[PDB]
Design a protein around this ligand. Structure first.
Ligand SMILES: [Cl-]
Ligand SMILES: [Cl-]
Length: 129
């Protein structure tokens, strides 16, 4: 599923991401834009043999099981395929664990490089939330 911008904002808000660990909703929308283009089905192989999955490009080395990643810990206790669903519940739950890991949203490279320090509120402008 490719979410609309405000559609994804509303889903993330309903799932409790707005201000989660102090990160306003626009941060999460911005991260998803640059990680996945709001596409739940996005996958990308990493150089180390892991793969990133879903709207927030969650990695198979620590977070989810994809059956093919060396050193996998599956800390979210979910198959990586669950992170590709049109229902973002599993991605949100796992993202909550990731953002609580100590480095906040710096865990998402695209967030640090493209969202951090910018007017992230722009990502929710116009939405009825
Ligand atoms: Cl915001
Ligand atoms: Cl933080």
């Amino acid at each position: 599923k490719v979410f609309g911008r405000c559609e994804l904002a509303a889903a993330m808000k309903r799932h409790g991401l707005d201000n989660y660990r102090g990160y306003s909703l626009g941060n999460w929308v911005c991260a998803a834009k640059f990680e996945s283009n709001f596409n739940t089905q996005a996958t990308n192989r990493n150089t180390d043999g892991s793969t990133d999955y879903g709207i927030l490009q969650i990695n198979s080395r620590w977070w989810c099981n994809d059956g093919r990643t060396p050193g996998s810990r599956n800390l979210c206790n979910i198959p990586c395929s669950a992170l590709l669903s049109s229902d973002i519940t599993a991605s949100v739950n796992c993202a909550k664990k990731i953002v609580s890991d100590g480095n906040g949203m710096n865990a998402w490279v695209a967030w640090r490089n493209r969202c951090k320090g910018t007017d992230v509120q722009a990502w929710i402008r116009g939405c009825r939330l």
